Amino acid sequence: EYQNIFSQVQVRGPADLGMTEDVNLANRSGVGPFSTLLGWFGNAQLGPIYLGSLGVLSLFSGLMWFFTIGIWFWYQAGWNPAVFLRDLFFFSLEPPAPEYGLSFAAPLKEGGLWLIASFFMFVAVWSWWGRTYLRAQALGMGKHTAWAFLSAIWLWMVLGFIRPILMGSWSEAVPYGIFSHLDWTNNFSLVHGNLFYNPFHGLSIAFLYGSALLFAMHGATILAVSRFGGERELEQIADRGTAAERAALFWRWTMGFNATMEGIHRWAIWMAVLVTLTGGIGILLSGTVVDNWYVWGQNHGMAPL
Template identity: 65%
Template sequence: MRSTPSSSRRSASSYRARSGPRAGRNGGTGGWSFRSGAKRGALSYDGEYQNIFTQVQVQGEPEWGMDDSGKSMQERIGKPGFSTLVGWLGNAQLGPVYLGWTGMIALATGILALNIIGINMLAQVNWSIPEFIRQLFWLALEPPSPEYGLRMPPLQDGGWYMIASFFLLVSVCTWWLRTYLLAAEHKMGKHVAWAFAAAIWLFLVLGLFRPILMGSWSEMVPYGIFPHLDWTTAFSIRYGNLYYNPFHALSIVFLYGSVLLFAMHGATILAVTRYGGDRELEQIVDRGTASERAALFWRWTMEGRIRLNL
């Protein structure tokens, strides 16, 4: 959003007016224009906002991003381009991509793991592509049999599974390291890396730590869509039904609860972008702003629900 300061003696509250059919700076028609001011007689702002419903896709010079170390620019690959389809959902620019040594290892080992899994599935249907597509949801690369314990089994009896698991483990861990190192390089917090580590912890517990403690690689999770769901069901029955587990219940509550809160917040800010609500941090402490309007909406909505229930 662009804005230009201008003096005004209009009301303190923001309002909107539909912009005319004039072309934007980079082509296309504009969205809505708005004017806002902190108090009567104070400096106000005229501008034009864009959101997902009124957007104008700008395709100018590509943005190359930050380069704190002075080396990242040389390590970025791919010619920057723009996608109109992607621009409907977010940033339309595609590339350049920075992988680094951690990204290259993660990509290479991840592709190897997927190829091993896919080729083994294809061999199970006698190399028939139509059958592979038809039975894809039921195909699986299974872990070794229980008699092998923690030993390396033959390739056709779980050996390929162990090799694929090794490459997958390396891929996931190096991608986590890439996330951590990039955050450190750009002087960011490590929140994304540690959130990713929580998911990796479950992956390691089910696929590495628990099988080792139980003394058999057969306890690992099979690679397949329906087979891994069947494994989850058997695991649940074996340990007394996961749905009765309070920690499982809490994880579901926080998962869906956080999604609901993010959706409520995002939809509210989107609803008040016509009043400049996307500048949330600038407005959060002032009266008569889009942020106050959004807060009042939920305050009155929740108060109404509480009074109805009473």
């Protein structure tokens, strides 16, 4: 049996420059190389990428954020390349201490650089959101990607900006560092009682597990009906074929209800968005309204005592 997991023979020809409605092509670059390695799985063509005003804004801000964290990491190793190599995962760019509160008077070396890098990150992420919206608009498409990204941005903003302001301290944002931000996560859980007893934390976990579930389900279904041209979904929405029917009937005979080629993607987008939506709500309530979630669960019929 051929499982359709990897292409067994590849083809290529002229590069596709893409559709040309309401798009300024002065900003679109030239097509890049073809990758035979990427071609065994999906498309082999790289580029062209669109480079606009927001593209340059986002590139500048993100590059400076990454560079600022890197320069702090180099300082923190004593400028030693070997120490930088060995402690790359242990370095950290840590926010101001609690006694500064929300003030921008923290010296350069316990959190002025954190504030600078955070400003760069803010500009980069919001520029990228605007760029997503405008790239969708230029082609006459819907703005669904912008709103899903907005959900992700909501969680990010709560973690780094809104919750520190509500608690009145920059010390409660997330440090820039691999193991350091993992320890921030663990210590956030320890300080507020179990986050396991945060109901919105549980909902967020439910929707992350549901994302993995639904997307295994959908990938498997589409690969199983790809023998009828099932992977061509816009056309199956346009003109229903036997792949769509067989998929619907499989799920109807399995669990009693099914979806449409169109509607399974509404399920998918909402399942993925609810993760960060409920996560942001839970983190915002965490500490501002409840500071011991296990006791809250005891009070709300969740924990035995």
